[PDB]
Amino acid sequence: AVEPITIADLTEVKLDGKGALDQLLQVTRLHLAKEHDAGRLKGQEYAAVLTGG
Amino acid sequence: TIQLKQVIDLLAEGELSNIKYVNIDTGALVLERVPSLIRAINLGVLDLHKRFLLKEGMLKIQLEEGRRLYPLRPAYQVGQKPKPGVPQFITEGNKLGRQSILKIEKIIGDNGVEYYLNDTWQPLNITTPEFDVLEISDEFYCHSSSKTLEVRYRRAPTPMKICVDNLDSWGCIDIDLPYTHLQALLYFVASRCQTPIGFMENTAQEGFNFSQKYEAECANLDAQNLRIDPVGNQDRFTRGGWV
Numbered sequence: 001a002v003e004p005i006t007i008a009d010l011t012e013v014k015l016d017g018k019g020a021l022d023q024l025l026q027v028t029r030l031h032l033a034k035e036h037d038a039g040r041l042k043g044q045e046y047a048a049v050l051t052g053g
Numbered sequence: 054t055i056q057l058k059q060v061i062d063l064l065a066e067g068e069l070s071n072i073k074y075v076n077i078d079t080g081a082l083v084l085e086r087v088p089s090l091i092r093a094i095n096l097g098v099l100d101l102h103k104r105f106l107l108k109e110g111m112l113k114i115q116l117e118e119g120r121r122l123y124p125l126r127p128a129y130q131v132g133q134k135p136k137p138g139v140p141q142f143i144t145e146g147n148k149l150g151r152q153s154i155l156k157i158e159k160i161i162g163d164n165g166v167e168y169y170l171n172d173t174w175q176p177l178n179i180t181t182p183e184f185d186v187l188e189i190s191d192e193f194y195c196h197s198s199s200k201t202l203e204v205r206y207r208r209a210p211t212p213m214k215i216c217v218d219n220l221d222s223w224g225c226i227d228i229d230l231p232y233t234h235l236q237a238l239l240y241f242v243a244s245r246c247q248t249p250i251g252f253m254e255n256t257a258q259e260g261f262n263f264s265q266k267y268e269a270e271c272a273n274l275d276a277q278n279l280r281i282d283p284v285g286n287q288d289r290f291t292r293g294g295w296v
Contacts, residue, residue: 033078039249042256043071046078 028053054107054231059224061094061235062087068243071259072250087223088215090242094228095212097241099152101234104271105280108208110153112146114187115201118194123187125154125204146204150211154185157206162199233279240267 011019127149169175210229244263
């Protein structure tokens with residue numbers, strides 16, 4: 001009953017992977033994308049927030 | 054003096070790329086806020102026509118003795134809709150729209166004489182009480198000897214009507230401008246659209262910067278003299294006496 005948690009479990013290198021880091025980044029991207037689609041973000045705060053986070 | 058709307062939108066992509074108007078965040082392609090973009094562009098064109106002449110028009114009024122007020126509205130113009138309560142006395146000239154008369158400039162009779170406009174106490178003065186109406190006094194009828202009038206005025210084009218079925222193409226629409234004032238119109242629209250967005254230090258000033266560039270470009274066009282400019286050379290020697 002010992003499943004070894006590995007780097008693949010944390011994150012595989014692909015952008016669309018299923019790693020925890022990957023999916024957290026994806027949900028952050030979705031929230032920012034909706035914010036930009038509404039008239040509330042320019043295309044530069046989008047990058048600033050992500051890089052900070 | 055025409056430009057395809059297609060080219061305009063493709064270029065405005067290069068300066069509205071930051072914001073919602075034209076881009077999905079992924080695969081930046083034009084959205085369908087094209088109606089709002091058109092409504093902004095029409096205002097820009099009107100402003101440019103305010104700042105420079107770029108156009109002028111002509112009418113021809115057939116006088117009627119005993120009349121006091123002649124309004125210039127698209128219900129009195131030949132070829133328009135003949136409202137029964139009004140007699141259609143504007144018999145010739147550019148088709149009249151809602152925004153066509155920016156200012157009346159010259160009034161020329163059938164004899165070649167030139168009457169006076171808003172010059173009080175002049176012999177045969179014509180007064181505009183409401184900026185689109187000619188008030189003709191009775192002394193004019195007493196000494197007129199003219200059965201018709203010719204009017205010249207500063208024009209602005211009539212925008213083309215967009216339609217929900219026309220949302221198919223939107224690229225056959227033709228803006229009415231020379232290309233120079235296109236380069237200026239780009240900055241105008243960009244400023245107007247970018248003003249109400251942004252909360253970072255450098256991103257809160259894009260609207261102001263675009264306004265500044267718009268003013269600079271207008272000044273440059275004035276300096277280069279790319280608009281119509283009549284210059285007067287009277288005779289002064291045929292009155293009899295100055296020779």
